[PDB]
Amino acid sequence: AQNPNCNIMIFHPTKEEFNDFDKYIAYMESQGAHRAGLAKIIPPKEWKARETYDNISEILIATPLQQVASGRAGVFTQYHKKKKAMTVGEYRHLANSKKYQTPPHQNFEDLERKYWKNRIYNSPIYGADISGSLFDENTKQWNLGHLGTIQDLLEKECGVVIEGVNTPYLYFGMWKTTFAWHTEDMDLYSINYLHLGEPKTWYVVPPEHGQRLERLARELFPGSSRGCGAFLRHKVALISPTVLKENGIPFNRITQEAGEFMVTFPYGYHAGFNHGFNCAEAINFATPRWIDYGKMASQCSCGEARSMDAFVRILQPERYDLWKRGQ
Amino acid sequence: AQNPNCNIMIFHPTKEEFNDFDKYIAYMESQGAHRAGLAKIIPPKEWKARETYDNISEILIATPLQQVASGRAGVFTQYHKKKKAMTVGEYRHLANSKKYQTPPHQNFEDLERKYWKNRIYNSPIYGADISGSLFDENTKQWNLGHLGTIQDLLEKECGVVIEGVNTPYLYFGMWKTTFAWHTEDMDLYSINYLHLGEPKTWYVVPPEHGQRLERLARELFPGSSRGCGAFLRHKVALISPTVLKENGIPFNRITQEAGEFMVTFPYGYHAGFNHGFNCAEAINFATPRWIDYGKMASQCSCGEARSMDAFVRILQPERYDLWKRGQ
Numbered sequence: 182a183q184n185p186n187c188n189i190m191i192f193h194p195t196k197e198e199f200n201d202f203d204k205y206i207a208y209m210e211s212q213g214a215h216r217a218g219l220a221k222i223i224p225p226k227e228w229k230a231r232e233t234y235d236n237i238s239e240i241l242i243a244t245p246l247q248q249v250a251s252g253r254a255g256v257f258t259q260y261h262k263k264k265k266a267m268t269v270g271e272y273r274h275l276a277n278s279k280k281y282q283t284p285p286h287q288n289f290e291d292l293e294r295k296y297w298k299n300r301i302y303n304s305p306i307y308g309a310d311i312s313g314s315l316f317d318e319n320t321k322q323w324n325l326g327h328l329g330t331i332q333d334l335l336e337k338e339c340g341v342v343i344e345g346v347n348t349p350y351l352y353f354g355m356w357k358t359t360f361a362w363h364t365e366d367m368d369l370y371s372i373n374y375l376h377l378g379e380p381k382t383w384y385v386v387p388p389e390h391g392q393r394l395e396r397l398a399r400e401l402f403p404g405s406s407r408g409c410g411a412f413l414r415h416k417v418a419l420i421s422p423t424v425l426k427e428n429g430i431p432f433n434r435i436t437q438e439a440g441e442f443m444v445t446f447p448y449g450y451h452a453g454f455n456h457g458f459n460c461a462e463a464i465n466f467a468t469p470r471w472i473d474y475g476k477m478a479s480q481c482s483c484g485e486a487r488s489m490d491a492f493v494r495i496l497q498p499e500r501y502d503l504w505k506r507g508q
Numbered sequence: 509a510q511n512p513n514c515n516i517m518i519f520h521p522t523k524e525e526f527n528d529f530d531k532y533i534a535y536m537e538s539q540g541a542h543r544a545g546l547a548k549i550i551p552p553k554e555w556k557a558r559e560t561y562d563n564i565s566e567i568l569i570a571t572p573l574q575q576v577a578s579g580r581a582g583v584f585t586q587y588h589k590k591k592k593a594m595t596v597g598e599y600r601h602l603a604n605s606k607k608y609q610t611p612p613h614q615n616f617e618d619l620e621r622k623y624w625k626n627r628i629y630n631s632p633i634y635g636a637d638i639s640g641s642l643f644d645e646n647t648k649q650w651n652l653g654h655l656g657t658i659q660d661l662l663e664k665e666c667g668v669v670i671e672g673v674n675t676p677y678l679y680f681g682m683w684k685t686t687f688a689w690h691t692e693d694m695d696l697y698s699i700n701y702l703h704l705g706e707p708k709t710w711y712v713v714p715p716e717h718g719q720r721l722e723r724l725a726r727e728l729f730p731g732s733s734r735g736c737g738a739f740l741r742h743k744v745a746l747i748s749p750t751v752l753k754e755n756g757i758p759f760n761r762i763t764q765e766a767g768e769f770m771v772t773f774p775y776g777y778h779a780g781f782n783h784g785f786n787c788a789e790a791i792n793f794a795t796p797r798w799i800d801y802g803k804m805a806s807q808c809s810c811g812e813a814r815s816m817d818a819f820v821r822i823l824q825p826e827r828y829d830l831w832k833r834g835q
């Protein structure tokens with residue numbers, strides 16, 4: 182077995198190796214990368230997503246989300262308060278203001294300490310889930326808007342044509358903006374490129390130990406757990422590395438910097454935070470190995486959790502009716 | 509001036525000519541094709557959208573629309589009554605049933621006569637605007653899911669990056685299903701491929717005479733006109749070729765058959781109907797020549813009309829606030 186400790190692996194493809202996305206994902210998994218739940222891919226030195234980021238200030242963040250925390254420093258939930266629209270230019274200026282800017286710190290470890298100590302006492306604003314892409318149409322390699330669709334993958338594997346289209350999303354972040362513990366919809370893969378700005382710190386639980394995190398979550402969020410058998414689908418729960426360690430949950434951490442890709446693998450629980458003003462782009466994808474995870478993915482049917490129809494309809498026909506009632 | 513009578517032109521590209529989409533659209537316009545408002549493109553004999561259509565019955569039509577008419581035979585409006593979900597297999601069976609099937613007829617002209625005589629007395633069900641594609645991912649030429657985006661076109665022409673993603677839609681039709689008189693959102697181009705089944709008959713007004721149609725529409729639909737300065741954006745008004753002829757409106761007609769593409773050009777008003785069970789796929793696109801049409805496109809701000817944000821925001825900043833109130 183490759184990567185038996187489930188370490189987060191870092192890959193440095195050559196430009197030749199960067200030319201076939203599916204092939205390289207499969208190569209990564211041949212080295213056991215998937216066992217960590219997360220991998221970093223450093224693009225070839227001659228690769229670029231686009232020429233410059235000088236012309237992005239007029240992008241509109243239609244519904245910025247103020248992330249309001251409740252609980253304790255290491256165990257909290259966050260809810261999203263909708264704010265008025267602003268441009269990326271206005272958002273960037275807000276992120277760099279005295280109220281929201283990254284504080285003085287010695288290094289990543291000091292910043293991480295400050296995040297978990299102080300996160301709940303501030304309510305940063307996140308420009309998340311904006312449909313769009315910052316890849317140049319002429320970028321041929323690892324262009325997240327030119328990947329094959331999950332609908333075509335399901336068709337290729339299962340022989341069924343389905344409706345739906347999957348496209349990338351942009352995430353404009355600032356210091357303390359947070360992504361809660363979750364796996365992807367239908368336990369899909371995700372790929373995330375950090376286009377510009379300050380880093381993004383990730384935490385991840387190996388897929389083989391995901392149920393351990395779920396068990397801890399039910400204990401730490403009893404109200405949420407009673408409300409929904411798959412409440413982590415609501416994407417609101419945060420648990421710090423110290424609390425995970427206290428409870429024996431196996432996990433790893435890594436910091437993503439501008440110009441780097443992160444891939445999350447099926448049923449790899451992850452969470453994290455942004456260091457300062459940045460912009461990432463992400464999309465879900467599938468491989469043949471995903472199908473069996475799709476079939477077993479837990480579903481939120483309480484109505485709180487936000488193409489999905491067809492995947493549940495085909496892979497989980499028994500769940501489909503009740504899941505559809507929740508929607 | 510090419511094509512001064514504004515005739516609908518039909519093109520037969522070679523496989524070599526079929527290899528550069530933008531180039532061929534530009535070639536078509538060099539021959540005056542755009543003046544008609546609509547063109548037909550017959551693909552090369554060796555081209556195909558996909559291998560077979562044997563595996564499409566499990567596609568879900570989440571919200572089939574029953575098209576209910578009001579008015580007179582040649583001048584009517586239609587509203588869409590939402591029906592319960594059905595699969596394409598179930599829809600196809602309904603379309604072929606005695607209640608909904610194409611009636612006996614001698615030819616296209618007889619069927620057209622029957623449509624305009626009898627359309628208002630039936631309420632056919634249309635599986636319209638389903639996000640998805642039936643093109644094989646391996647189809648390299650004129651794959652409507654692999655076109656360059658309107659957002660990238662605007663960026664390339666105007667130097668502004670914007671949010672948004674544009675993807676194709678599927679249309680499952682039956683006899684008498686109808687598309688009302690309209691131009692595309694922001695007076696964009698559209699491209700439509702008829703994947704399978706019975707034909708689709710199109711009517712079109714040359715872009716240079718669009719305001720003549722608008723004037724007639726205001727006279728024929730006085731209530732709708734008073735309610736909204738751009739009510740044709742609601743996509744509910746039908747006017748027959750006989751009534752257009754009586755009122756001196758220049759127009760043309762053509763019937764699209766399975767395996768053929770239709771392109772609508774900026775500000776080319778069009779309408780039509782399906783002959784029987786079929787499936788079409790369509791998407792909007794842009795070229796450099798569209799920009800000036802985008803800037804002048806009329807907007808519905810009464811709230812009735814259904815990526816758009818950014819195009820109005822950048823090309824029509826003066827209209828943006830009031831348009832946003834309507835939404």
Ligand SMILES: Nc1cnccc1C(=O)O
Nearest residue numbers: 309352359360373381461
């Ligand atoms: N929202 C997310 C979800 N999964 C991974 C990363 C993020 C992010 O916000 O960067």
Ligand SMILES: Nc1cnccc1C(=O)O
Nearest residue numbers: 636679686687700708788
């Ligand atoms: N809905 C439409 C809009 N424009 C052109 C064609 C159609 C169609 O229904 O085929």
Ligand SMILES: [Co+2]
Nearest residue numbers: 364365371445
């Ligand atoms: Co994620």
Ligand SMILES: [Co+2]
Nearest residue numbers: 691692698772
């Ligand atoms: Co149209």
Ligand SMILES: [Zn+2]
Nearest residue numbers: 409481483485
């Ligand atoms: Zn739930």
Ligand SMILES: [Zn+2]
Nearest residue numbers: 736808810812
């Ligand atoms: Zn209106």
